[PDB]
Amino acid sequence: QTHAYHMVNPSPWPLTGALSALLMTSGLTMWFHFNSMTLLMIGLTTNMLTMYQWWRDVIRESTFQGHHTPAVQKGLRYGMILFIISEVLFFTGFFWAFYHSSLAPTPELGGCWPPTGIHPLNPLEVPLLNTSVLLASGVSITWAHHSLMEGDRKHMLQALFITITLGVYFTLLQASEYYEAPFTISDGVYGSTFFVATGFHGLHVIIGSTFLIVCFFRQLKFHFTSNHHFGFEAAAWYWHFVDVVWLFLYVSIYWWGS
Amino acid sequence: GARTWRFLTFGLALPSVALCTLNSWLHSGHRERPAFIPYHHLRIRTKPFSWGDGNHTFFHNPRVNPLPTGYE
Amino acid sequence: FENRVAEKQKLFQEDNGLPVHLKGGATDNILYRVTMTLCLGGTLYSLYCLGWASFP
Amino acid sequence: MAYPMQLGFQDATSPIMEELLHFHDHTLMIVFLISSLVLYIISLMLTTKLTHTSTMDAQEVETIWTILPAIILILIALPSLRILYMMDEINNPSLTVKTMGHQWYWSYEYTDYEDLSFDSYMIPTSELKPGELRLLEVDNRVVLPMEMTIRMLVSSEDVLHSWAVPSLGLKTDAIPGRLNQTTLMSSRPGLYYGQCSEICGSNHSFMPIVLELVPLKYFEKWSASML
Amino acid sequence: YEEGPGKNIPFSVENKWRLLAMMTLFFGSGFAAPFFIVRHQLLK
Amino acid sequence: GGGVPTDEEQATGLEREVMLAARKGQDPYNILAPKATSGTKEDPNLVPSITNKRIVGCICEEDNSTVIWFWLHKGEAQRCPSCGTHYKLVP
Amino acid sequence: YQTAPFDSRFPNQNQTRNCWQNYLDFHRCEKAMTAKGGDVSVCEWYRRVYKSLCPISWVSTWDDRRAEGTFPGKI
Amino acid sequence: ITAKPAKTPTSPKEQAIGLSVTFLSFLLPAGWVLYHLDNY
Amino acid sequence: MFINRWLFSTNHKDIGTLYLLFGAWAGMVGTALSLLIRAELGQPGTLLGDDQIYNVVVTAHAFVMIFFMVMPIMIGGFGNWLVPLMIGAPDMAFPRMNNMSFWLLPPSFLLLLASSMVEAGAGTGWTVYPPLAGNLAHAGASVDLTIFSLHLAGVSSILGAINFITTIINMKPPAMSQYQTPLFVWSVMITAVLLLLSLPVLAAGITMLLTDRNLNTTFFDPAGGGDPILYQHLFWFFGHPEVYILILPGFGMISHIVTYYSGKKEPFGYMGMVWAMMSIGFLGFIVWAHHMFTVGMDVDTRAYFTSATMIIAIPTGVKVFSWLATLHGGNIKWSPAMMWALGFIFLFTVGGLTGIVLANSSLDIVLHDTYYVVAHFHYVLSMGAVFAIMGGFVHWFPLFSGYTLNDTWAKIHFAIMFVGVNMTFFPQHFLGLSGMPRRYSDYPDAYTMWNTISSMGSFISLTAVMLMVFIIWEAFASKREVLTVDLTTTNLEWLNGCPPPYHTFEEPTYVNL
Ligand code: HEA
Ligand code: HEA
Ligand SMILES: CCCCC/C=C/C/C=C/C/C=C/C/C=C\CCCC(=O)O[C@H](COC(=O)CCCCCCCCCCCCCCCCC)COP(=O)(O)OCCN
Ligand SMILES: CCCCCC/C=C/CCCCCCCCCC(=O)O[C@H](COC(=O)CCCCCCCCCCCCCCC)COP(=O)(O)OC[C@@H](O)CO
Ligand SMILES: CCCCCC/C=C\CCCCCCCCCC(=O)O[C@H](COC(=O)CCCCCCCCCCCCCCC)COP(=O)(O)OC[C@@H](O)CO
Ligand SMILES: CCCCCCCCCCO[C@@H]1O[C@H](CO)[C@@H](O[C@H]2O[C@H](CO)[C@@H](O)[C@H](O)[C@H]2O)[C@H](O)[C@H]1O
Ligand SMILES: CCCCCCCCCCO[C@@H]1O[C@H](CO)[C@@H](O[C@H]2O[C@H](CO)[C@@H](O)[C@H](O)[C@H]2O)[C@H](O)[C@H]1O
Ligand SMILES: CCCCCCCCCCO[C@@H]1O[C@H](CO)[C@@H](O[C@H]2O[C@H](CO)[C@@H](O)[C@H](O)[C@H]2O)[C@H](O)[C@H]1O
Ligand SMILES: C[C@H](CCC(=O)O)[C@H]1CC[C@H]2[C@@H]3[C@H](O)C[C@@H]4C[C@H](O)CC[C@]4(C)[C@H]3C[C@H](O)[C@]12C
Ligand code: CUA
Ligand code: NA
Ligand SMILES: [Zn+2]
């Protein structure tokens, strides 16, 4: 080749990923209808196996084999931005469901929002703490980024560790909230919108935290250079996306919808 | 630079978290649970849940989450 | 920790004809066989489950 | 109702169906003309040995290709929107009737004065009286006064249905938890047929609507007899 | 990998009659499937 | 506070080759658009190749949307069949 | 009274809230008049309008819920 | 487009076989089901 | 070697070939389902004796044709084969992720064929509206297997969209601007943008339906304060962009085919064609509620959706007139591909025009949920997509395979198909105007004649499908290997021969400024 692009070795992971999707969906069906978790647990296992080996191979190709030329890195930049945009539109559908329900509350609700019998969480208690936590993690991840560009191993690791710790604190605070909440997913459209929207957000926080932990261990193993660290940038963009989705949830569901 | 973002982390961001943590831990006491009313728009059961006895939500809290028939 | 990237660059650039998903050595082969066996077995099990659910 | 080998709309029973007929004739003329011009221009492009294969300048012709269609759309939209606003225009109904969709039949409620309500089921083919219409007759017709503005309210007690009467220009979805309003005015007595117009499961094809339009005096006698 | 006409496909075109068998099974299985699903639902 | 490797210390494989070639002003991996000569028979556009032919796309005039594609062969300069611009292959 | 007249508060195809509002209005008035032993004939306009517009099954569901103590609107 | 002569020319008789086999592969299975709808 | 090549592919050409095979197979399934629909309607009374099965057949027909036939062939097949070749790129940006977009489709299809085999199927319509699609009116696994089928298909196309946008932005020759890329490449980039934005909204909506069916949510259930009409908004916010997704790549192939067989170096008004496709893609996001003119929305909303919908005719007309202006002055080669493309222009125009009729909410009251709508989309989508596919297939078959078709057979095939689809769908206009509802297993006696003719047309199109398989067999059986094609100077995908080597553009093109 006298181009800069990456011709990827033939790989089984697309097929194992596709089969993991079949096992997870057929597994959910077998859990909801046929009282069994077997297929679902095989599909969750094969999904984690697939993602581990696929992203391992991407590390091998880049850090160890040198395939990420500037042109390849630029492609991955576009790919992550476009992925985040698809994730924004996914959340938009849940925001649309929330505003649809809350702006025109039906007679079954008492014709009011929040519905009759719903006692919202106080948005100035743990929801406000969660907001300070994710905003603070946006500052610390930015400190990590700058440390890395400036060649500062120790301060990159400290900043990234602080960012992960905040992600975990949010997740434990939200788990605790969920358990103390006097309303459930089954408490009509108020519970439906609250738990499905904040639930998908919580999944994204765990995904994002997991990505940051991957970056933390790669940094510990000296994989990042001061100039080449796209996995760190991608995880930072993803992390900022998770913060911004939280801010929209906080204003919409917790504050305006209370 | 890194110096500025570290200054913001320790000088503003973590102090905010410390203060919201204090604010939260001062309002952390258990609220008195409201009288049970079997409202038809709440405690929805169109299909049994796929776990436990089919009638308990996933993060069911006996103290604050009544069943369709009331507090356990 | 010490910087051992050069030694991983040497391993993953060895002229041995292996594809990247197996180039780490025998452990790659075990993890590949576990994955593929679970996927193929799980898929055959999903088909059985379909045959079962297709009748009352 | 439709008749065999029918090409167009059922004859208008209401002033707004009449308006839709005139509006369809206008729009169809434009559809015909544009359809025909494209076919004709295809045949014109394909029937000469003369050639011009060098770069052609597109700027001037694209003015024509955008302005002419924009004018044509305005000429469709003006009458379209006039009729839209007529079918919304405040009227004073003298009567309100509710219909509730069910799997698979309609119920009717006349609750202005008395609590009158009844179910309206398709007559099975095996039970049709000689000369009665397969899939269209019901046991209990919607008795209504002619030459009067009527408010129909449409809802459902189960899945989505849609309450339609093509000869009156009517189609309103029947949505549980929602009360949808339409206006009905028949210029004529007679029987006016329609069919459920939102897929509602296995018997979607078999829950028709039959209006029976009679003079007010007869509508009153029928209401009175129902006590 | 083999290159060239009849070599860039997951099926053989070495023998036109074996090919006809494979094409028949391939498109025929697809076309038959809805008739057999309808049969299946009726036999319930 | 250091301990982060640099591209110069740690880049490898094609990333490193691209990095070293850019330091010398060379473009072996075809990252940059080559700048046209006047394209006359005396001053033909010089098209590098690792082999004896390479596909040329000719944007005959600035802002043409139509690109003209042809194989350029080793040997006598060839001309764009749309604008007549000269191209010469330099293995 | 023939039927419920046009109500500029509810000018659109969705008449759900018109039915709901008149049902609430009638029962709020009936409570106000019964609570002094006053006279429920003052509430007659709201009664005629809700009976005209509201599905029988909605009226019947709401009545059951008022008696059960699960009606979610304020009366 | 220009092409080499057919490496393995398919005669009118070979075409009648391929066509017949192709049509039958569509018609026989569907025909069997539709013919037996009564039995189902 | 067989498993490495066809199961572990990282090759844009092999993956395109897998998508074409997958789509051709899916088209047989979708056609079988269409013939069962028309067999139930071909005489008055009942054929199947089970209207739930009819409803399942109609539902599966639509899902197979849209998700397994059109999008795989257009985007997965022609997209993967042609895009890299038309921009001189060595492969897709994400050649391994590309393989997973492909391998998600067989599992997606399996989930749909499982929906139909368990309980009584999903007899919902392809819209899957609650409450019919809910856990009371459709109890059991069928609707959940349909939701999951759509999730896998959704992920396949979202990842595929990221791949195409990235490849088309990042992997052109450095001198090539976006205004120097072929119209087919534009059509795929714009289709990929519509997919990236619309599929996530569908995924949100069908996830809400999943949770209403299984986790006691009430997004669509009035008892909990929910609204069935919310589902409709989410579904159609995706569903209108989806109909533009289905035709845009077809627009791109048509531009190439008309240009090629007119003997032109270029389509007429290149920048107008890019503008038109971008305009259609943008307007396609602000019109969705024309699928909801009978649900009881406000008059001013109806007025807005009528007006916005009609605007799309302007850019669309620019394309139609631009195709005609490409033919203008051409040395016309009456190849079978040209015939497909001329059929496309005409039939697409007819269906587009019945679209403009339906845009008028007032008339839509009477035409909504009738055979007029079915007529509209079988012209613009069913014939538009299919004619564009068959045109592209007969044009590029020799590039992909290395072998020529028999042109006379291909023309016979075109002729049979043109007669069949018109005999099938044209009479559906009459059925719609005269008031026959769609989604019906049987009809009042007055509708018998046009249903009879429509069903007889469906058999003509079946004869065409069977002949098409014969024609592909004859080309592989005879082995006439391509030597030369004309107009390679303006059709770069041909310049590496037929078929092109496994690896093309290892040495990229030279393009100067
Ligand atoms: C290829 C797929 C495709 C395409 C491109 C279109 C294109 C259009 N469609 Fe259609 N549509 C469908 C597929 C498609 N549609 C499907 C599948 C459904 C049903 C879904 C379901 O319910 O299952 C449907 C349904 C549908 C409805 C809902 C009807 C109802 O259910 O009651 C409406 C309403 O406005 C609509 C309108 C349009 C319009 C205005 C266009 C326009 O984009 C067409 C514009 C083109 C032209 C106008 C012709 C070319 C132009 C000229 C030659 C210029 C001059 C013309 C004029 C001045 C008018 N279509
Ligand atoms: C692309 C979309 C598409 C295609 C191609 C078709 C094709 C056909 N459809 Fe349609 N149809 C829909 C989309 C499509 N349909 C949708 C969305 C609905 C609505 C569902 C609902 O109500 O919920 C529907 C509904 C619908 C109905 C209404 C059902 C009802 O309301 O009760 C009818 C009635 O006749 C019908 C008939 C047909 C027929 C006879 C064919 C065909 O037989 C016409 C001829 C076409 C072919 C035979 C295809 C050939 C192509 C190949 C075989 C691919 C080859 C591949 C390669 C060369 C690579 N379909
Ligand atoms: C701590 C922070 C965040 C934690 C995240 C969640 C933990 C457990 C499950 C993980 C997955 C979550 C994703 C979102 C899905 C739906 C519901 C999740 C929200 C949640 O956890 O809500 C709980 C209910 O969970 C339930 O029903 C059970 C949930 C389990 C079953 C879910 C199955 C549904 C999966 C849907 C898959 C769709 C995938 C979309 C792919 C799209 C591709 C285009 C709330 O508990 P509760 O007792 O009602 O009220 C509290 C009372 N004190
Ligand atoms: C208990 C846990 C349960 C939950 C599990 C669910 C999943 C969790 C997974 C979290 C994601 C981990 C992703 C790790 C990716 C590691 C590979 C990586 O980061 O690869 C980098 C490239 O980035 C790239 O491909 C970028 C690749 C980006 C991957 C994007 C990941 C977001 C994934 C979202 C997953 C789906 C969510 C949808 C839910 C609806 C490699 O290049 P550099 O970094 O420049 O290195 C090279 C230098 O060393 C040279 O000097
Ligand atoms: C109900 C349950 C249904 C859900 C089933 C889930 C479906 C499938 C199972 C998913 C298995 C995932 C396995 C890992 C996939 C990793 C893809 C990846 O990371 O892809 C990268 C490209 O996409 C990029 O960057 C950016 C994009 C990274 C995307 C990561 C994958 C996420 C998949 C789920 C997201 C759906 C979207 C949610 C929005 C609605 C790399 O591309 P490659 O071609 O590989 O390499 C190129 C080389 O140059 C690298 O050195
Ligand atoms: C090398 C690979 C090895 C493959 C081994 C697969 C792992 C699981 C196999 C056992 O299958 C399980 O059997 C349990 C019954 O015997 C099920 O009980 C389930 O059903 C219960 C009903 O009592 C519910 O409480 C729960 O859903 C659950 O416990 C459980 O769901 C199911 O998974
Ligand atoms: C390496 C590749 C992977 C290979 C896959 C391994 C396949 C495992 C087969 C085990 O089958 C299980 O049998 C259980 C016991 O018979 C079922 O119990 C379930 O069904 C029971 C029926 O008695 C109920 O008690 C409960 O729902 C529950 O125990 C359960 O559904 C099912 O999974
Ligand atoms: C939607 C597309 C459908 C198009 C229809 C295709 C045209 C018909 C093709 C032939 O199909 C066959 O027809 C035979 C009858 O001609 C059937 O024999 C059946 O009837 C015979 C005689 O009547 C018996 O001898 C056999 O045992 C018996 O199976 C046979 O099953 C069936 O395969
Ligand atoms: C001593 C060691 C040196 C790492 C190295 O240079 O190889 C240092 C560098 C940065 C350190 C990390 C950062 O200080 C952040 C964390 C601080 C906590 O008190 C311990 C864990 C914690 C995650 C540290 C682990 C360990 O002490 C690290 C990894
Ligand atoms: Cu009721 Cu269709
Ligand atoms: Na029938
Ligand atoms: Zn030139």
Numbering used by the authors:
A (entry chain P): 4 to 261
B (entry chain T): 12 to 83
C (entry chain W): 1 to 56
D (entry chain O): 1 to 227
E (entry chain Y): 3 to 46
F (entry chain S): 3 to 93
G (entry chain U): 11 to 85
H (entry chain Z): 1 to 40
From the paper:
pmcCytochrome c oxidase (CcO), a terminal enzyme of the respiratory chain, catalyzes oxygen (O2) reduction coupled with the proton pump, generating a proton-motive force across the membrane. Mammalian CcO consists of three mitochondrial DNA–coded core subunits (subunits I, II, and III) and at least 10 nuclear DNA–coded peripheral subunits. The electrons from cytochrome c are transferred through CuA in subunit II and heme a in subunit I to the O2 reduction site, which consists of heme a3 and CuB. Cytochrome c oxidase (CcO) catalyzes oxygen (O2) reduction at the heme a3–CuB site in the transmembrane region of the enzyme. It has been proposed that the hydrophobic channel that connects the transmembrane surface of subunit III through subunit I to the heme a3–CuB site is the O2 transfer pathway.
To identify CO2- and N2O-binding sites, we treated dimeric CcO crystals with CO2 or N2O in both the fully reduced and the aerobic fully oxidized states. The FO − FO maps of CO2-treated–untreated and N2O-treated–untreated CcOs in the fully reduced state showed clear residual electron density in a site (site 2), the same as the Xe2-binding site. Therefore, we assigned the electron density to a single molecule of CO2 or N2O. At site 2, CO2 or N2O was oriented to form weak hydrogen bonds with both the hydroxyl group of Ser108I and a water molecule (Wat2). In the FO − FC maps of CO2- and N2O-treated CcO in the fully reduced state, elongated electron density was observed at a site (site 6) the same as the Xe6-binding site. Because the electron density was significantly stronger than that in untreated CcO, it was assigned to CO2 or N2O. CO2 or N2O was oriented along and within the elongated spherical cavity of site 6. Previously, infrared spectroscopy detected N2O-induced secondary structure changes only in fully reduced CcO and not in fully oxidized CcO. This may be consistent with the binding of N2O at site 6 in fully reduced CcO. The O2 consumption rate slightly decreased in the presence of N2O.
